[PDB]
Amino acid sequence: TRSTVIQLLNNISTKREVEQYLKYFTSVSQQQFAVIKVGGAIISDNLHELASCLAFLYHVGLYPIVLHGTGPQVNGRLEAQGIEPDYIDGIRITDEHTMAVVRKCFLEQNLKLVTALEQLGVRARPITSGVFTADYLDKDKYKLVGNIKSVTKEPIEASIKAGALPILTSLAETASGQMLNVNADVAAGELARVFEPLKIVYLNEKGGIINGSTGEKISMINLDEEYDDLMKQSWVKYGTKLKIREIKELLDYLPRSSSVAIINVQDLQKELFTDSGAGTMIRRGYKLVKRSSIGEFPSADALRKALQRDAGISSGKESVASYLRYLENSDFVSYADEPLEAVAIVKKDTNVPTLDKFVCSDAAWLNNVTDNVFNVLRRDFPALQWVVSENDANIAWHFDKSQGSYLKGGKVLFWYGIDDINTISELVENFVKSCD
Amino acid sequence: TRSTVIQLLNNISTKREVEQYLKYFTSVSQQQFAVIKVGGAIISDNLHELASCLAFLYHVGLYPIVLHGTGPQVNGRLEAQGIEPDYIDGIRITDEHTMAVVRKCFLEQNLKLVTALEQLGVRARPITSGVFTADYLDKDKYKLVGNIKSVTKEPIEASIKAGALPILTSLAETASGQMLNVNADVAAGELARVFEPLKIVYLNEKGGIINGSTGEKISMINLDEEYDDLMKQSWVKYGTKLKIREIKELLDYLPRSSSVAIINVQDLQKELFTDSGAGTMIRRGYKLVKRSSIGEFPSADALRKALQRDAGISSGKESVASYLRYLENSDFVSYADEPLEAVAIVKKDTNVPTLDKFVCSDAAWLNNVTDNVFNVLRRDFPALQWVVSENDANIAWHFDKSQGSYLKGGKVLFWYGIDDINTISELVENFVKSCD
Amino acid sequence: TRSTVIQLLNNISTKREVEQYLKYFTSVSQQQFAVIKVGGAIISDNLHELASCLAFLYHVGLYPIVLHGTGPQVNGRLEAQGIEPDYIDGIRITDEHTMAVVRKCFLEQNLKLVTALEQLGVRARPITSGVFTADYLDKDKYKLVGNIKSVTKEPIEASIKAGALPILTSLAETASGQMLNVNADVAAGELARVFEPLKIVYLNEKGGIINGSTGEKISMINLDEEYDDLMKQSWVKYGTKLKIREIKELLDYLPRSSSVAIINVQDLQKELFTDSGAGTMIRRGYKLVKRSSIGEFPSADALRKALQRDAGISSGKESVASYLRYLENSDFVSYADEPLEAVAIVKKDTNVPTLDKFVCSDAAWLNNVTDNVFNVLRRDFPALQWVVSENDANIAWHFDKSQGSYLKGGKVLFWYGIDDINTISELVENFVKSCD
Amino acid sequence: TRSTVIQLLNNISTKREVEQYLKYFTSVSQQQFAVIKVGGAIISDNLHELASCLAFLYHVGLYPIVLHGTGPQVNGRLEAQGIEPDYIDGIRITDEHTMAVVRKCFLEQNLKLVTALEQLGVRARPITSGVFTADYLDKDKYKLVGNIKSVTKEPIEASIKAGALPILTSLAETASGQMLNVNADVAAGELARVFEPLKIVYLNEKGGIINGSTGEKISMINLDEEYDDLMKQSWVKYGTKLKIREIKELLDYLPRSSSVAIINVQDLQKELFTDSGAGTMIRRGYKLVKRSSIGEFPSADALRKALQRDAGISSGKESVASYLRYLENSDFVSYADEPLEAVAIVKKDTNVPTLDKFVCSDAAWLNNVTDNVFNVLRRDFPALQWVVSENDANIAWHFDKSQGSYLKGGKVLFWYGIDDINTISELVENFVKSCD
C-alpha cells in the first residue's frame, strides 16, 4: 500500500539515495539481491524488528536469502541439561548429545522466524536441510562439525521463484545423510560465493566496527586500498582480523560490484542502500595508481579514450592530442584507477597546484571512486585549487570538498588548504584574468 | 470462483453424496482432513492430475497432509549407476552409497510436486526433514533404515496454519542427526495415528488390491474377519503383506470407523468424500460369527432384543417367540457380528436358500457392516434369494447386490447366482404364491 | 473460501437441485443469470436478508441484475411534506413536487442497497439513470409518468464485466433528459426481454400465488400445458390473469431454459434453484405429442437430430438413416415433446411391446419430462419391456418404473405389467439369446 | 507492488520533493486529496496516460475526485448529424435535440474512463447523476443549461469510502428531474468549494501559461503578491484574465494550504506534488512585507517567537532581548511574510550589508518562501554578505545563491555582487578576525 511508500521515503535522505534505490529495483536481477546472515541472538530477542524489516524488502519486491544461526539459547539448554559446552580452536566440539540439542534449537528458531514473517504477510519457506553438502572438519577434533563442500541452489531458487523468502539454517549434511554443525558465517560466505549477490549483510548485535584507538566508528573500508596497512595495525583486535580477512577472501572471488556490510539490526534498511548508515561497509574498490609521466600509463591510448569523456574536450576547445603534448612537457602527478574510470591530473607548477583534469565516469561517481581520489589528493597535496562548471551535476560536492569558492561567469573556482589573504587574492585574480 | 463450485457439483451424483460432502466441510476440523500417501511413481509420471486435484482440495479450503515416496526413479538411477537394488523383508537395504542417491531423489521429487502445486496457485511448503524422529531398524540388516520413534507435529501444523499444503518426504532422522530411509507407507501410517484424520488415502498405481487369483479387485476388506486367511493366500505377494499388516496395525489403534482407502489418483476427489470411489477400502469392522443353532448364540436373550428391531416383528405379524420356535426346528446358517448390530439368517431348506431375516441397524448401515455381511453370504451361498419392502430406505442397494428382481404388491423379490430360466420361474411362483 | 461451499451445500436438498445449480454455473453466460425485481418495501425493512442473499449469488459467481422500486416510504414522506398522494387509473399522478420527493427516495434507497452489499464485500454499482429511455405516458393525466421506449444495455454490461452487481432504479428519462416515474414490474420485464436471462424473479411481499377456491398454493405452472384451462377458470382473480398473461407473453419470446419466480424474500435463495421452495414458479415446459408415422413429425430432420443423441447410434452400430428406414416400415407409437428434448419410440410388434428408443436429454431428465413420458406409456401400454445399460446414470429410475429385472453381461432387462410366469421366462430367454 | 515504488522514485528529483511527497501521505487527510477536472479531449485521445496516472494515485492510497467533460467528440457528432453547433456568450445553446446527443456522449465517455481504470485494477464508480442540483441559467438564452445551486456529497463520499474512484459527469439536474448541461470548469470549482481539497487540477491539452511578451512560461503565480500588478498588465490576454480571476476567486474561499494547477496531462503526477513540474501552478501564498523598525511589525511579540527558532539564540549566545535592543538602534531592512514563517534581517551599516538573521521555518523552506525572500534581497541589495553553519541542513542552497564562499572553523562566509578583489579580501579578513 502506502505503508510501504511511507517507509521507503522515511529512509531517503538525499538525491543520491533515490538514484541508489532505483538501481536495485530497475536492475533485471537474475543477479540476486542479498544474502543476510542473522545471528541466533536476534531471532530469540529482537525478532519483531528483523521481521518487520525483511517484510519491507519482500513488499518492495526484493527477495533476500536469509541464513540464521542459533547461538546463546543453545548454550543455556546444554547447561540446563548438565553439559558444560566445549570450544576448541573457536569452534564447538559437537558430539551426538550436543548435536541433538543444536538441531532442535535450529528448527525451533528457524520456524519461529518463518511463522513470524508469515504473520506479517510475507511468504516464508523454511529450508532446514539440503542446501549445504559437507564433510567432517576433523572428526577427532570437532566430532560432528562440517566443512562445506558445496551449495545446491535448487531449493533457494525454486523458493524465490515461487515467491517466498527462503530462510536457511546453517546445517550442512554429508552424502550419506549425517547432519553437521557449521559456522553461520562461513555458511553465509559460501552462499555469497555461489549466488554472487549485490549485498552481503552480516547482522551482528554489536554494530559495525569501532576503532579501539581513536574511538571513532568505521563507515567504509576500501580493501584494495586500506586492507594491508589497516590489518597490520596494533589497535585492530584479533577477532576483527579473523573477520576482516574472512571478508577480504570472500570479495576477492566475487565481482567488484559486490559489497559487504556489518550492521546492527535497527539500522538495516538504511545501509542496504546507503553508505551513510552507521555500521561498517566493506568492499574491494579501486587501487588508484599514481603516475608522473604519459609513457608510464600502460594504456598509451585508453588515457585518451578516458579524457574524451570530459565536456570541455568533447565540446572542442582543445583536443586531447593538443592537451597530451602540453602534459608530457609538464611535471604533473596523475592518480587514476586501473580501468581509467576516473583520472585526476594535478599540474604541480603553480603554487596552489591546479587539478587540471578530473575526468570521472558516471559509474565512478555512484561508486564514490571520486570521493577516494580526493582523499588521496588531500594528503598528497595539502593545498590545492580547481575549476568546475557552474552547473556541473555535482557541484554541491565540490563545494563540500573546498574551503573557498569564487564564481566568474560560467566557471567556479575552488580551493583548499590556503589562507594567506594575499595568496587567495592571487588565486582569484589569475582566475578572473583567465578570461582570454 | 465458480471454477471450484462446478467441479464439486460435477462430482455429486445422488443425495447421499451431498450429505457426505457436508459432513467433511461442516466438521470444525481441528481434527485434520486427510493424510494422502503418494507413491513416487505418481510424481514422476502422473503429476498434473495429482496437482490439479490437490489444488481443488486447497481451493475448497481443505488442507490435505501429503506424504510422498520415491520408488522407481531411484531404482533406475541405482541401476544406471550399476547397483542391483536390495530388498530384505520388504525394506531396502540402504548403505551410505544408496542413501545419498535416495536422499537426492527425495528432494528432487519433493520439490517437483511443490513447484507443481505452486504453479497451479497452491501454496506448498516442502518439509524435507524434521517431522519424523527415528532410530535404526536393525543396523546390521537394513543399515540406515529407521523405525519411527515419534512424529513432531509442529511444522505440519504451523504450515497448514500459515496456509500452505505440507508436502512431506518420508525421511526420519535420529537424535544425533543421521537421516534414515523409512517406507512411505509406514511413515503414512505413523502420521495417521498422530493426526487422527477424517480420511486416509493410499494412492497406488494399479487402483486398489487386485486379486491375483480371481483377477479383479477386493472392494472392502474387513480386517477383523478376513485378515488372516486373506493374507495367507498363495496369490498375495510380500510387498502387499508389508502394506496389509502395516494397515491392520494402524487401524487396530484407531477407532472402529477410521478407515483406509486404496485408490488410483484419477479418482481421488471422489473418494475423499463419497464411497462411490470403488477400490480397496480397508477397515477393522466386525468379526461376523457363523452360527447353526439357537443355543449356540452366547446371548439367549439379546438375539431376541436384536430381531425386535425388524419392522415386521415390531409391527406384530409374528412375535419373536413364535419365530424362534420355527428357527430352532430348521437348518439355518446365521451370521451375526459380536454385538448383534447386524443379524442375517439364511434358511437353507429351499434350493435357492432364503435370507429370511437381515436385521441391520441404522448404525450398521452407515458403517457398511451390511456390505460385509453380504460379502460373507456371497462366498458361503453362491446362489441366494431374499425379499425387501418396496420402499426400504436402501432398496437401491439390494438391487445392486442382485442379478434379478420381481415385484408383487408391496414386496420385492431378489436373487443372485441363478439362471436356469425354469428355476427362476420356480422362485417367482413360490414368491407370488406366498400371498396367504 | 469454504464459507461459500458450505452455504451452497446447505441449500441443496436433492439430486435434481444439484443438476439445476450446475446449469446456471456451467452456463457460459453471455446469456445472463437473472433479472431480480425488488419492491421498495424490502430495502427499507428487510434489507439484511436481501443483501445476505445477493451476496451469496455474487460469491458463488452469479451476477444478478437488481432492479428496485420505492413504494411505502415515498407515501409517508409525501404525507410528512403535506401532499395527499394521488392515484388516477391505478397510477400515481406525479407532478414536479411529487417527482422531487420520489427521486430523492429512489437515490437514497438505491445507494442504501449498494452500501449494504458493499459492506458484505460485494461490489455494487449504483445505476441511477440512463438504462431506461422513455416518453410521457400521458402528460395531462399522469404528468411526469413515463412509458419505456427502450433499454440501453451498455452500463449494465460494463458493470457485470468489471465485476459488480448492477443496482438499477426504475426511473426512465426522456431524450431531452426529464426523468419520469415508471412501473418497477414493467421495467423488470423490459430488461428481461433484452438480456434474455435464465431466471426472472419478482420479489413480492405477498409470497407467490394461492388458489382462491381450494386454498392450496401453486408451486409451478407449466404454461404450454396448463395456461389455457388455468386461465379460463372461474376462481382465478383478474389481477392474477393480468399477471399470468403478462408472464406467458414474456417467456413466449425467451428461451425454454428461462423461468419466472414469484417469491417472498425470505424463501429466495432456495427457489432460485429448486422448485420445492414455496412461492410460485412459472415456465413454458412441455406437451408430449403422440405420433404414429415418421412423416407425422413436423420436423422431418430434427427427429434425426434427436435420435443422434442416443449412445448406440452415436457410437455407430446403426446409423440413423438405416434406423429410420426400419421405423417407417413398422407400427410404432412415439411420444415426444414439442422441441424433441425427449423421444420415446415403442415398437408394438412383439407381445410385450419394446421401448426401442428412449432418447432423453440431460435437460429433459432434470425437468422430469422423462417421468411424464413414462406415465403416458403406462396407460397407453399396460405391459411393456425395455433394456438399459448396467451403469446408465439413472438406472435406479428404471428399476423404480419396473415390476421385474434381469441382468445379463452389461445390459439390464426391465418390464412391467406382466406376470404369466411363462411369458416372463419368454422375455428372459429372448433377451439372454439377444447376445447375437 | 514495486510498480508503484518505481513510479514514485522516477518522479522524485531532489530532497525537497521527498519531503513534499511525505507531507501528502503523512497528512491524516479527512481533508481530501484532489479534484481533477478532465477535458473531454483527453478521454477520447490520450486515455492510457490519464488512467495510468489516476491508477497511481489510487494505488498509493489517494482518492482523486475526477470530473470530466465531453467537448470535441460532441461537436463532431452534431456535425455528422448535420447540426451546426451553437455558442452564445461562450456557452452551448442546448435544446432537447442537442441535449440528447450531449448526454449520450457524456455517458459513453464516462463509462470509457471507468472501464479503462477498471482494467488497470482500479475500482471506479460512474456517477452520471445526482451530485449536482441546479436550475436553468436562462431558459430563453441557453435552453437546458443549468446554474449549479448545490453539490450533494453523499455519493462521492460513499464511493471513496467503499474504495472506488468517483468519476463524475458534469450534468446537474433540477428538483423536478430535468438534466441540464453545465460547464465542466464551473462544476469542478463547485466541487472544490465543497470538499476543500488540497490540490485542484485543471487538465488542459494546451499546457499551462506562456508569457506572450517575454516568451517565458509561468511556473507559479503567488496571487496575494502578484495578482494585482500581473492582472493590470498589457501582455496578459483576456482569455488568461478571465481564468486568472476565476482561480483567484476560487482560492479566496479555500484554505491557504489549497492550490490550483493547470497542466498538460503528461506532466500530471509530477506537479501533483512538486512545483518544478512544467505547467502553471497558482495559489494565494505569502506577501513579504518590508519593515524598517521593530515597532513596525504588527506582532510586537511573535517577532520574538520567530527569532527564537534560530539555533544561535536557542543555544544561548545572545538572547533575543539583547539582540532586539541592538536592532532597534540600527538601520536595518527586514523582509518577512505575513505569518512570520520566514524573517530576514539585513544590517545595512557595513558596505557589503550583512544578512544578520535569516530565520526560516521548516515549512517556509518546503514552501520556498526562503527562495522568494532572497529574490527580494537580490534587487533591493545588489551586493550582500552572510554567514551559515558548515552543516546547516541546506548549505547547498546558500552556496547556490552566492558568488563567493570562505570557510573558517565551523562557519561559512557567503557573498554576492562584489568583485573588487581587494574588497573581497576585506570581507574574508573581517570574517576570519571575527573569531573572538
Author numbering:
A (entry chain C), B (entry chain D), C (entry chain A), D (entry chain B): 67 to 502
Paper text:
We report here structural and functional studies on the arginine-sensitive NAGK from Saccharomyces cerevisiae (yNAGK).
The lines joining the centers of mass of mutually interacting DUF619 domains are oblique in relation to the flat AAK tetramer; thus DUF619 domain pairs protrude from the plane defined by the four AAK domains. The degree of AAK domain opening is even higher than in the arginine-containing subunit of the truncated enzyme, corresponding to a 20° rotation of the C-lobe. The pulling of the C-lobes by the paired DUF619 domains possibly contributes to this opening of the AAK domain, which is associated with rotations of up to 55° of the DUF619 domain around a hinge located at the AAK domain-DUF619 domain linker (351GYK). The comparison of the GNAT domains from NgNAGS and yNAGK (with an r.m.s.d. of 2.52 Å for 111 residues) explains why yNAGK lacks NAGS activity. The AcCoA binding site in NgNAGS, found on the boundary of the N- and C-moieties, is blocked in yNAGK (compare Figures 8E and 8F). W431, sandwiched between N460 and T436, blocks the part of the site where the pyrophosphate moiety of the CoA molecule would be expected to bind, thus rendering impossible AcCoA binding.
